[PDB]
């Protein structure tokens, strides 16, 4: 499952190991398309990486902090630090690759 994160608890949820953060919004069409792909990816990495979702409308601060201009945007965090960024729709194969590159 994908845990939701907000401006209030972002810093405590990300400090961990490797985490993929999905910056989305309800009005985002491409985000709706990648949603199911992330749910599957999450399962393929249980115990390896955490996948979080952050609604940019209700959490503008975190979106501003990491320069999230367009969505969908996915950022890979490694021990509290952003190490990679992926923009737009992406196939599960391409997302898994990006994660493996940091595990």
Tell me the two tokens of residue 51. 């996948």
| Cα distance between residue 72 and residue 85, in whole Å | 11
24, 72 in Cβ contact below 8 A? yes
Bin 6: left if φ > 0, else alpha if -120 < ψ < 50, else beta: beta
Q: How many domains does the chain have?
A: 1
Domain of 52, CATH number, reads 3.40.30.10
71, 62 in Cβ contact below 8 A? no
Which residue range is the domain that position 101 belongs to?
A: 1-103
The residue whose two tokens read 């992330």 is: 38
| Cα distance between residue 5 and residue 60, in whole Å | 12
Experimental structure resolution, Å = 2.2
- 72 prior amide bond cis, ω within 30: yes
34, 51 in Cβ contact below 8 A? no
Tell me the two tokens of residue 13. 């949820």
| Cα distance between residue 9 and residue 30, in whole Å | 26
Active site residues per annotation: 28, 31
Quickly list DSSP for 4-64. Answer: E--TTTHHHHHSSSEEEEEEE-TT-HHHHHHHHHHHHHHHHTTTT-EEEEEETTT-HHHHH
């Amino acid at each position: 499952a994908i845990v939701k994160v907000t401006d209030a608890d972002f810093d405590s949820k990300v400090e961990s190991g490797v985490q993929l953060v999905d910056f989305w919004a309800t009005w985002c069409g491409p985000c709706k398309m990648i949603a199911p792909v992330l749910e599957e990816l999450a399962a393929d990495y249980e115990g390896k990486a955490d996948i979080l979702k952050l609604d940019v409308d209700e959490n503008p601060s975190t979106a501003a902090k990491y320069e999230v201009m367009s969505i969908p945007t996915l950022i890979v965090f490694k021990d509290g630090q952003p190490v990679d960024k992926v923009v737009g729709f992406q196939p599960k194969e391409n997302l898994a690759e990006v994660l493996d590159k940091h595990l």
